[PDB]
């Protein structure tokens with residue numbers, strides 16, 4: 359149940375605890391930062407505030423101000439006039455409290471606190487430059503095919519899913535892109551303190567009994583249309599278990615002359631089915647790259663009810679860091695609030711949560727120990743419009759608070775897939 | 779600049795499909811060089827006569843959260859009854875709807891207006907899946923109000939006895955509507971979970987003739 363592994367390597371949860379247990383609080387009013395000390399005895403005599411303003415990860419301005427706060431006291435820091443850019447995006451302010459000097463318990467340059475705020479946002483009004491190229495649709499009995507030069511997109515008309523993508527003669531997918539509504543259960547979803555308890559109230563059990571893990575997709579609609587400058591595929595799927603419809607998924611895929619595939623997803627969830635762990639898509643990619651790079655919350659694993667410690671910026675990590683090696687395997691390594699994701703030739707833009715690794719949700723839920731996991735061929739990608747909270751208040755009864763359960767009934771998310 | 783914000787057209791294409799016409803639009807509401815909202819829509823008129831409207835709105839994170847995200851128009855028809863599947867029968871709002879029940883409700887048009895002495899937004903009904911008015915039917919998941927008074931006349935007139943019924947019927951269909959609040963009435967009282975702060979919004983509507 360540790361914040362650390364037996365060898366004292368941090369679990370991702372530790373960083374959330376560090377952030378929430380901060381000894382300095384911050385408010386932002388206009389250009390003023392108010393820093394309040396939660397110490398009771400010490401003045402801030404080994405602390406400096408670093409501030410940084412960035413546009414979608416791009417550093418615009420930064421600075422340093424010494425901290426001189428009495429225990430329980432306040433210091434107002436006035437920011438210099440910020441040299442606003444004209445280009446579209448969201449400006450983010452980040453502050454960090456840094457300890458310049460080593461102590462008996464920390465190294466020089468130790469970070470004790472941080473915080474972020476959204477500053478100005480400039481919405482993108484300027485149209486994209488109209489591409490000259492135009493995609494073409496090749497219909498067969500079994501498939502819709504879209505080609506754009508080297509690029510090729512294949513929609514299986516029997517299943518209703520994007521079954522394959524081609525760059526010239528190279529395959530991009532090892533498994534089709536399908537809706538996913540389940541996760542490999544966390545310890546908080548399993549809910550039991552004792553071994554032989556088959557607790558009928560736990561999330562995994564409610565999910566198992568409703569047939570979430572074994573629901574079969576049934577195709578309702580799979581049509582293709584040609585527009586002036588794009589091809590539009592439209593699909594509708596029903597997930598059923600024992601005649602009962604749990605989820606309906608309605609999708610458009612819009613492929614334009616730029617080679618961008620725009621996916622719209624609208625999901626209905628039956629109000630009497632237990633709230634799903636996630637509402638997303640997954641596929642097994644053929645590529646295995648070294649680095650994952652994203653504009654979103656990071657660097658560490660973060661979930662909707664555990665993301666306060668994560669900062670929004672441009673993060674770049676090795677693939678292996680995008681997996682969390684919990685001894686008992688589960689859904690893991692998610693990052694939330696992501697606007698852009700980069701992996702090998704692929705780029706996904708939108709507002710989504712994702713995890714990426716060499717292990718399928720299936721392998722993760724079938725394996726009892728982490729050392730028994732084996733890297734699957736290619737890379738498993740889950741991209742979620744929505745993900746349920748993880749809970750934790752205890753680990754033997756449902757603990758995901760109401761506001762983090764997927765209860766809306768109707769959900770919408772949109773993704774742009776392109777090959778940069 | 780929310781009240782004086784002017785719609786600027788970005789896109790307006792038409793496309794013929796196998797069994798439908800697809801109109802795609804984009805707009806930006808600006809005030810003094812600042813982009814407040816972007817609205818992206820598709821209209822799909824198919825062979826059965828139904829028009830499906832899909833709306834996706836962006837709100838700048840640094841503009842005050844808007845009062846509503848919706849559509850309005852003035853219908854030519856003045857009918858006797860309003861029939862809806864949703865929350866009712868009385869006026870209800872996102873942070874004042876626990877008393878309302880989900881059912882099929884049928885009231886005279888006049889009942890769809892609440893005569894507050896100082897006129898304001900009024901008569902909203904939430905959680906509506908189907909709205910019927912004369913030959914018109916709207917389906918989806920929306921909030922609406924319907925009356926002879928425009929949002930403009932309501933905000934310009936100071937007493938209820940000075941209001942005149944306009945020509946036809948003003949319809950407001952909202953995908954999202956701000957809470958009313960009221961913990962007090964001299965400071966912002968709308969709780970955070972009832973402010974339209976998501977940044978991106980989505981609703982869909984089917985309009986047909988029954």
Ligand code: NA
Pocket residue numbers: 402403404405406424425426
């Ligand atoms: Na100091």
Ligand code: NA
Pocket residue numbers: 896897898932933934935936
């Ligand atoms: Na008024």
